[PDB]
Design a protein around this ligand. Structure first.
Ligand SMILES: NS(=O)(=O)c1ccc(N/N=C2\C(=O)Nc3ccc(C(=O)NCCc4c[nH]cn4)cc32)cc1
Length: 282
């Protein structure tokens, strides 16, 4: 760890603190994450697998430094997160071609991870990183295998499913897609039940018709209030019918009906996809 010079604190997650740092051996500027824990053998093997999960839309894990019961992860550095970009673009809105490019790129990243049976599990604007070239990348990946944000949590997680699928990441990305379009979080819950009830108030209380097996889920309660579903024309205006159709498939209640990342890439919404350059003030 004497090989790195800290520049500034760039964030704090559930695992630990992230610093921008300079590698005294290569001159490289990196993101250094100190994992708060010595380190379990199961974690070392899993994190070593992530070093090989390389894709242009996945923040590169450069090195795993396991020294003196402490664990450090050395990552590729990107200059801004989607959260700051969305806040900076709030008066005007992110242009639809850039939203489309970012969604397409993230679906490429998820299609890759999911093909390797790797789930993110905690997608949110804060772990989506962007650069000046128009790229967007997924950070803080297969690490799951301040108050924690519930806004992007899939309903099967909230209802107590222990063995959830790659569909949880599609749900989170659908929530982020809606937020980029409307400039407001889709489901800003501040408790697990407020999160669930916000989802139910918009998409309708799920039942055995739309989600077979839902009433047998661990945290499902027959006493849940029964709300009627709302139109997507009301939920994400002024998004066009291609975008609303894709969003509806990413937000299906039944994880088995929810669109995969691979099928989403073929959706007619991406017929005119391009790669614009964002206006980044760094
Ligand atoms: N706000 S900002 O637009 O000025 C701005 C600028 C640069 C950056 N970079 N972050 C990173 C980077 O380059 N590689 C990374 C690899 C992994 C992680 C990661 O594990 N994150 C979870 C913990 C967390 C951090 N932040 C909130 N939770 C982060 C980064 C982030 C935000």
């Amino acid at each position: 760890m004497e090989n790195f010079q800290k520049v500034e604190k760039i964030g704090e997650g559930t695992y630990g603190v992230v610093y921008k740092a300079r590698n005294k051996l290569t001159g490289e500027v990196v993101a250094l994450k100190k994992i708060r824990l010595g380190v379990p053998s199961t974690a070392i093997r899993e994190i070593s697998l992530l070093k090989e999960l390389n894709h242009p839309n996945i923040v590169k894990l450069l090195d795993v430094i396991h020294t003196e019961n402490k664990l450090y992860l050395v990552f590729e550095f990107l200059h801004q997160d989607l959260k700051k970009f969305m806040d900076a673009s709030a008066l005007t809105g992110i242009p639809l071609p850039l939203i489309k490019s970012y969604l397409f790129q993230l679906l490429q990243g998820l299609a890759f991870c999911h093909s390797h049976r790797v789930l993110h599990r905690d997608l949110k604007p804060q772990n989506l990183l962007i650069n000046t070239e128009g790229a967007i990348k997924l950070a803080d990946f297969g690490l799951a295998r301040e108050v924690v944000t519930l806004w992007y949590r899939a309903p099967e997680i909230l209802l107590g499913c222990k063995y959830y699928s790659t569909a949880v990441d599609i749900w989170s990305l659908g929530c982020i897609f809606a937020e980029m379009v409307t400039r407001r979080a889709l489901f800003p819950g501040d408790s697990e039940i407020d999160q669930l009830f916000r989802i139910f108030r918009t998409l309708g209380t799920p039942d055995e018709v739309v989600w077979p097996g839902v009433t047998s889920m661990p945290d499902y309660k027959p006493s849940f209030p029964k709300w009627a579903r709302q139109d997507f024309s009301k939920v994400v205006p002024p998004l066009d019918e291609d975008g609303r159709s894709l969003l509806s498939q990413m937000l299906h209640y039944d994880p088995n009906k929810r669109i995969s990342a691979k099928a989403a890439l073929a959706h007619p919404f991406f017929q005119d996809v391009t790669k614009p350059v964002p206006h980044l003030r760094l």
